[PDB]
Amino acid sequence: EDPQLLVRVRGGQLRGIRLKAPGGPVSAFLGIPFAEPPVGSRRFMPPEPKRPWSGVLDATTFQNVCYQYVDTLYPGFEGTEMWNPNRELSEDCLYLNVWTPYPRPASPTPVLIWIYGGGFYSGAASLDVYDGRFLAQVEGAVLVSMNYRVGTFGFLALPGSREAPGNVGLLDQRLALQWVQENIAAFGGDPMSVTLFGESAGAASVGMHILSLPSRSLFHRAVLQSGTPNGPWATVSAGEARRRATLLARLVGCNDTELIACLRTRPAQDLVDHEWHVLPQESIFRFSFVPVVDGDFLSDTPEALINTGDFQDLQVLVGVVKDEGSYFLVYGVPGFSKDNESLISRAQFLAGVRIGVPQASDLAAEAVVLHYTDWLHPEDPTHLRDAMSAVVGDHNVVCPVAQLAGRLAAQGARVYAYIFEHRASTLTWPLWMGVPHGYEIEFIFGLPLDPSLNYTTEERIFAQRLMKYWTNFARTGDPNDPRDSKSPQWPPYTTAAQQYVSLNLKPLEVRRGLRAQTCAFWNRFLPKLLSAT
Amino acid sequence: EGREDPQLLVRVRGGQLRGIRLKAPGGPVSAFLGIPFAEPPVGSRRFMPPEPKRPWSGVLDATTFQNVCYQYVDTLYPGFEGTEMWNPNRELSEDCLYLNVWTPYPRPASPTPVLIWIYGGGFYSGAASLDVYDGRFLAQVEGAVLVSMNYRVGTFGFLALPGSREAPGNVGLLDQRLALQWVQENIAAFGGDPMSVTLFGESAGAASVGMHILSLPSRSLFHRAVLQSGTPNGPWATVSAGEARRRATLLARLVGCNDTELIACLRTRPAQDLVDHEWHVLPQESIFRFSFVPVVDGDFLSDTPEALINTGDFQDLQVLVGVVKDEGSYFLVYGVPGFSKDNESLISRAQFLAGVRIGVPQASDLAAEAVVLHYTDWLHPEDPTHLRDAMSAVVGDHNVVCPVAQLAGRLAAQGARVYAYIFEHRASTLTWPLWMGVPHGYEIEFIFGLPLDPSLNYTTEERIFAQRLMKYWTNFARTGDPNDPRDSKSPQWPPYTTAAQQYVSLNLKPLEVRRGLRAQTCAFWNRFLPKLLSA
Ligand SMILES: CCN1CCC[C@@H]1CNC(=O)c1cc([N+](=O)[O-])c(N(C)C)cc1OC
Ligand SMILES: CCN1CCC[C@@H]1CNC(=O)c1cc([N+](=O)[O-])c(N(C)C)cc1OC
Ligand SMILES: *[C@@H]1O[C@H](CO)[C@@H](O)[C@H](O)[C@H]1NC(C)=O
Ligand SMILES: *[C@@H]1O[C@H](CO)[C@@H](O)[C@H](O)[C@H]1NC(C)=O
Ligand SMILES: *[C@@H]1O[C@H](CO)[C@@H](O)[C@H](O)[C@H]1NC(C)=O
Numbered sequence A: 001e002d003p004q005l006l007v008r009v010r011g012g013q014l015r016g017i018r019l020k021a022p023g024g025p026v027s028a029f030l031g032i033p034f035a036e037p038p039v040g041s042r043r044f045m046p047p048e049p050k051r052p053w054s055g056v057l058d059a060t061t062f063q064n065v066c067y068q069y070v071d072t073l074y075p076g077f078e079g080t081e082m083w084n085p086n087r088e089l090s091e092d093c094l095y096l097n098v099w100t101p102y103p104r105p106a107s108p109t110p111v112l113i114w115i116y117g118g119g120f121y122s123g124a125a126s127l128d129v130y131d132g133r134f135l136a137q138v139e140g141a142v143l144v145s146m147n148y149r150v151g152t153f154g155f156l157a158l159p160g161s162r163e164a165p166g167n168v169g170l171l172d173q174r175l176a177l178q179w180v181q182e183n184i185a186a187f188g189g190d191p192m193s194v195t196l197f198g199e200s201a202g203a204a205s206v207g208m209h210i211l212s213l214p215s216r217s218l219f220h221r222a223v224l225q226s227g228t229p230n231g232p233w234a235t236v237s238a239g240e241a242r243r244r245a246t247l248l249a250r251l252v253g254c255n256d257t258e259l260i261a262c263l264r265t266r267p268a269q270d271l272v273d274h275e276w277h278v279l280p281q282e283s284i285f286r287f288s289f290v291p292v293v294d295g296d297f298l299s300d301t302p303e304a305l306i307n308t309g310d311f312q313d314l315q316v317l318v319g320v321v322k323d324e325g326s327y328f329l330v331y332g333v334p335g336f337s338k339d340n341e342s343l344i345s346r347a348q349f350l351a352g353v354r355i356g357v358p359q360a361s362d363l364a365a366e367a368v369v370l371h372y373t374d375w376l377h378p379e380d381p382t383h384l385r386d387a388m389s390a391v392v393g394d395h396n397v398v399c400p401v402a403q404l405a406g407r408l409a410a411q412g413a414r415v416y417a418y419i420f421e422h423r424a425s426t427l428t429w430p431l432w433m434g435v436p437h438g439y440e441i442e443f444i445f446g447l448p449l450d451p452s453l454n455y456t457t458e459e460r461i462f463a464q465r466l467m468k469y470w471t472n473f474a475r476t477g478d479p480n481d482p483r484d485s486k487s488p489q490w491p492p493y494t495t496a497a498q499q500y501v502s503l504n505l506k507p508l509e510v511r512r513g514l515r516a517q518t519c520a521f522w523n524r525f526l527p528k529l530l531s532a533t
Numbered sequence B: 001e002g003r004e005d006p007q008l009l010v011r012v013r014g015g016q017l018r019g020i021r022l023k024a025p026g027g028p029v030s031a032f033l034g035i036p037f038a039e040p041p042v043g044s045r046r047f048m049p050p051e052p053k054r055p056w057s058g059v060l061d062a063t064t065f066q067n068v069c070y071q072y073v074d075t076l077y078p079g080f081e082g083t084e085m086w087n088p089n090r091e092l093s094e095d096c097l098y099l100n101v102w103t104p105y106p107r108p109a110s111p112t113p114v115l116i117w118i119y120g121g122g123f124y125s126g127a128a129s130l131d132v133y134d135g136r137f138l139a140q141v142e143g144a145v146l147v148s149m150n151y152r153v154g155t156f157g158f159l160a161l162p163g164s165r166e167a168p169g170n171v172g173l174l175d176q177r178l179a180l181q182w183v184q185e186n187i188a189a190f191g192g193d194p195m196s197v198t199l200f201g202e203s204a205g206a207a208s209v210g211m212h213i214l215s216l217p218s219r220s221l222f223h224r225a226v227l228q229s230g231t232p233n234g235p236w237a238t239v240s241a242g243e244a245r246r247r248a249t250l251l252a253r254l255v256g257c258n259d260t261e262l263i264a265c266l267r268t269r270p271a272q273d274l275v276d277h278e279w280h281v282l283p284q285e286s287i288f289r290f291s292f293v294p295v296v297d298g299d300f301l302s303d304t305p306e307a308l309i310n311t312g313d314f315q316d317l318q319v320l321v322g323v324v325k326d327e328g329s330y331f332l333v334y335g336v337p338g339f340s341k342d343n344e345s346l347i348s349r350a351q352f353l354a355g356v357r358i359g360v361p362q363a364s365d366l367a368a369e370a371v372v373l374h375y376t377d378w379l380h381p382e383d384p385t386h387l388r389d390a391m392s393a394v395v396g397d398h399n400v401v402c403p404v405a406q407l408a409g410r411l412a413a414q415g416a417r418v419y420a421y422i423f424e425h426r427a428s429t430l431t432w433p434l435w436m437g438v439p440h441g442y443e444i445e446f447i448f449g450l451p452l453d454p455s456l457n458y459t460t461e462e463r464i465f466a467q468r469l470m471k472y473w474t475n476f477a478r479t480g481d482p483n484d485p486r487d488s489k490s491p492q493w494p495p496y497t498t499a500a501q502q503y504v505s506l507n508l509k510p511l512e513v514r515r516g517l518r519a520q521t522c523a524f525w526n527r528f529l530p531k532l533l534s535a
């Protein structure tokens, strides 16, 4: 047997598998348990450390996907299926994966931990876009990704209860982080250099680990791609979490202890079947079971915590894609489809705003419409379409990111900001969606280096550039290549200059102001409105 | 008569006039100055509607400007040309209802289109006798008949106790209307065509023009209209009956005074006493707000200008509207701390917030914040230069630029032929500091053709520029179209439409067409802000 594929961790022995990357071999250790299976009476409960095992544990294949909703909007369409579970569904899903160079690193190597997105209701670390073999082979990185419980199983909460305290899916991540501290050195990883990176909900998670004291000893740097702990969708209050919980109970036929008990007797799919039915308003970019402000994992609201925190020791990399809000429109906004160009009326644009901004009063929705209308072409359907997408993208991602970047920089943190503007040649969504939520990922992970994927040679060169930014940031807290002495360099985001760079096929371009005027509308004015309307 | 110039003797309904032969740079013009069109509104006639002038005996000398209507005199900068040029240049009196007429010399052969000028000055000041309203150039170069009238301003013109008969309000507007009727009856005796009468005015005069469009008994008195940097709609041009009544009884208290007994006491007061307490009745600390302005009485103005503009049919109407580049810059020195003409007026963010409350005095705290957030440059939210220019823009957009855009849009959508401009040329002779750019009222001297007078030190280009503007205004007066029908070599001036929102730049360069009258920012002032304040 290959002694490179044999690792001893604190729970026993593992056997990895040697995988082929276009530039050489990597060692992969897939399906490693970091927790006791959260099944039976362990549903809704905090995770427990995995018990030791005898013999050699087979770690050559991906484990099961955490039980979750499966998207059926466009059946067979590779643009939606690419996010769908590629393994069997099970509540027994608390496993992680490790990629490493072959042979294992001679010296301690910086670690990247990926936390997947999926709106806290879906996702898996086994998806092709999260394949860590390229980063391990090309940049010699140790890459880790875990599964964490999503939906009811991960975030159903009856705050104050002992049997559904909330945020267990976040605790799953933290336990995987502790596992890395205890075990990564056996793979060649440096536990004193751990960078978290995640997209969407994963970025929000990374953000919440920044804001939770127990997590802060488990990593040193953070990357938040198109997601924030602050904002309208990533958290709920104890009252709203409690509300959605007993409503789901009432829907499936079910005192807290008695309520949770009956819920635990329910088959997994019975809970998923009514998952979307507990949202208080008709909406998009809104999810039923997400992290809750419990006063424990989150001592206060993320907004309150980023306003008051000292981030002097922090180094962050944040950013967005060009068209954050485009594909959420086809999931609830009338007039939008991936099968036409989605040219909409004006009445439809006002209607879509009540759905895109479901918490807005009449006056606040009016303010949004009047801000986003191009008064030179106030009824042009093309413009009305592009603005609906902008309303959604800015409200949910771009401005919460700008808000976070601003507070962090102002309060000591070292912040780097980007906007991802390249659209993949292989994208299957229509052109009107441009660069949609989550399509920077396949480039960070280095997928275009696989010739069977049919990317362009320019995209391949682009992917290699991004892997260097991300890995150099992990090594240093600075995404700038210390070998390249060319200028322009990537400058840190500050509250004064507000500098950020654009990521595309052309060399880095430095820009200033991250949707400054429009985000001032969202971050400074709208709160004053709703808190008076 | 017998030994005098036979070409200067004219009879009007009230009697005989002797005018004066005036020298323009390119020839002589006929001037008839100080023609009474009303009985002197003095004594028991203060606050009262004007009665037409009773016929006189003999030949009235019409060679000098008559008295300026009693008004406030600007003392902010004593000796400074920038302020003095607007101050009264004749004696102050309540006996001031006279008009002036300029015609070619000798007088026109065929009936000639008439221009009637209505001066501005916030309804508290102004005179038709000022140098910048000199009609000699238009009359000489374009062969136009020009009429300018004095109208009562301030308390004497607009103090109202709505519903009463001793102070019905809007009498300053009735003076203007009476002068329009005078032109209808008498202008043919000068060679003027009473069937081609175009109104034009600036600031409050523009608002006055707008109110004549909206008042039925005035629509038979003119045919076309030009509105320069002013609208009947907007925050300063009108007050409600309740507010006018409120300001009227307050002024009464401040001087020592049943509506009858109250107005009777006011009439016993010296004119100067009324002027001395005029500014003391405003509800808030403010700029671009005037104590005594037209009132919505349900008579001259059947409803609010905004209501009339929204619901009116304007297929018969042809209007020319526009603004200057920096409408708000000089109102800042009359009440916003941190602003002067003697320094660069670079201000702090704190001064910006304080100035917004003054420039938008009716704004709630929430609305004021909305203004600040819209006009803040979030890339440089503390830059004193930007904050200075933004303060000016707030005052300019709120009071002129957006009411005009609102007016143009509703008129165009409802049948009217609308032409729109922005005036971007700063006079080489301007005495105001550079930071004020092209301030309120500094297109006027170009429309009247003052750069033609070589003794005034304008440049050759400004002289050529002035002639273009006279062409536009006169062509529009003649045809309802500023364009020259016999000039394809020059760029055209397209009408303003809802569909395209076109307007032109007025400067030293040829016409440039642009789209959108500050579309985004005016959506804020005209569409969102009202919704906000009513909550
Ligand atoms: C992060 C979630 N994305 C990433 C890849 C695939 C998935 C796309 N689908 C969505 O984000 C999605 C959204 C909403 N919504 O409210 O926004 C929704 N509703 C209400 C029915 C359903 C959705 O998918 C099934
Ligand atoms: C409106 C009169 N203007 C136009 C042409 C020249 C003349 C200049 N003076 C003004 O615009 C002016 C303004 C204000 N204000 O409210 O903005 C004011 N207040 C409050 C005392 C006094 C003013 O002059 C004495
Ligand atoms: C696109 O398709 C959807 C459903 O297929 C429809 O609701 C929408 O109206 C269509 N848009 C246009 C412009 O036809
Ligand atoms: C200009 O003068 C005014 C009044 O004297 C004063 O308030 C202001 O501070 C001055 N501004 C500057 C930049 O000196
Ligand atoms: C024009 O310039 C001359 C030459 O200096 C000067 O004497 C005269 O006073 C100026 N006239 C005006 C109105 O500025």
Ligand SMILES: [Cl-]
Residues within 6 Å of the ligand: A237, A239, A240
């Ligand atoms: Cl709530």
